[PDB]
């Protein structure tokens, strides 16, 4: 009767991996004969199978069925092994296989805590994923970022640790600098946004990349042909999260200033997107604290009228962030704007 269509797809994938593993065990560096060349994924119809699994993974019912059959392990194993075998290849079959595999993993980690945990526990795969950010396929990078994004969203303690340990933050930030396509960059930044919320080390590792803060401030005035605000919302959200670290560092503060950050950030308080506002409010909350030059430069661009608008908003993060930023500016005035003078 019952076809077990999905089971048969996973068996193919499991089988191919066993064969690759067998080839890896024979063909190590201290090596025996090369009278057995590698398994090639084209020769065992692997794209088709992973492709169909990828397709089915969009639907939630199918995901539930895969999860009973251990589909996540299987697909992650497949991705890992094709990376470990063929490196940073350009072959279309390997890149397509890797993409489909990654998309399936994006879908299987979406909304599922057990799977996020599980995939993160697979450390050889995590390393393989992170290394793919250096691929020449930005379409693949877009996928890998998307995986990393979902793993970093509500990561438990272990998953967070692992994500840091495999060098994900520093690799995505370097990835971002080189990305030429918008869709790719959206995912890269979305992942970084999630990751920057985790811990100090991640914030630190972002700021510590050559061109990073320059680039991030640049995203705040990104010109989209997509007629979309998602790059500004993401890059701004990253900046807001790292700004706690920037606040207390002058070298970094300086890089913002020489790219007109605070000027731009004030224009964001106007902006129509509640996200762009919330981001700019929380960024200023930290940059308006305990630094005299920036404190005054904000007075001299009329931040106080601007922040007075927002203090009575129903949106808590706008209300807090603008009030807090205002309070810093109030309680540390240039003489000119004191109550005693100029009433």
């Amino acid at each position: 009767h019952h076809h077990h269509h999905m089971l048969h797809l996973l068996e193919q994938i499991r089988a191919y991996c066993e064969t690759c593993w067998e080839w890896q065990e024979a063909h190590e560096p201290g090596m025996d004969q090369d009278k057995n060349p590698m398994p090639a994924p084209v020769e065992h119809q692997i794209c088709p199978a992973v492709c169909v699994l990828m397709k089915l993974s969009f639907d939630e019912e199918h995901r539930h069925a895969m999860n009973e059959l251990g589909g996540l392990q299987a697909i992650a194993e497949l991705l890992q092994v094709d990376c470990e075998m063929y490196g940073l290849t350009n072959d279309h079959y390997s890149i397509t296989l890797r993409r489909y595999a990654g998309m399936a993993l994006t879908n299987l980690t979406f909304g599922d805590v057990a799977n996020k945990a599980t995939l993160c526990s697979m450390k050889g795969c995590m390393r393989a994923l992170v290394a793919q950010l250096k691929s020449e396929s930005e379409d693949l990078q877009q996928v890998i970022a998307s995986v990393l994004r979902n793993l970093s969203w509500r990561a438990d303690v272990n998953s967070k640790k692992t994500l840091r340990e495999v060098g994900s933050v520093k690799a995505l930030m370097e990835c971002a600098l080189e990305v030429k396509k918008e869709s790719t960059l959206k995912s890269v930044l979305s992942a970084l946004w999630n990751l920057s919320a985790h811990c100090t080390e991640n914030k630190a590792d972002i700021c510590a990349v050559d061109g990073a803060l320059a680039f991030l401030v640049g995203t705040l005035t990104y010109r989209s042909q997509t007629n979309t605000l998602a790059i500004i919302e993401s890059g701004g959200g990253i900046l807001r999260n790292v700004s706690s670290l920037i606040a207390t560092n002058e070298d970094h503060r300086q890089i913002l200033r020489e790219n007109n950050c605070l000027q731009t950030l004030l224009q964001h308080l106007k902006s129509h997107s509640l996200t762009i506002v919330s981001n700019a409010c929380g960024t200023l909350w930290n940059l308006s604290a305990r630094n005299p030059k920036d404190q005054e430069a904000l007075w001299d661009m009329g931040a106080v009228s601007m922040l007075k608008n927002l203090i009575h908003s129903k949106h808590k993060m706008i209300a807090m962030g603008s009030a807090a930023a205002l309070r810093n500016l109030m309680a540390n005035r240039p003489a000119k704007y004191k109550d005693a003078n100029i009433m």
């Binding site: 993974s57 979902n150 995912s187």
Partner: peptide
């Protein structure tokens, strides 16, 4: 950024 399905 939250979580999402694959594009």
């Amino acid at each position: 950024a939250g979580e999402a399905l694959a594009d």
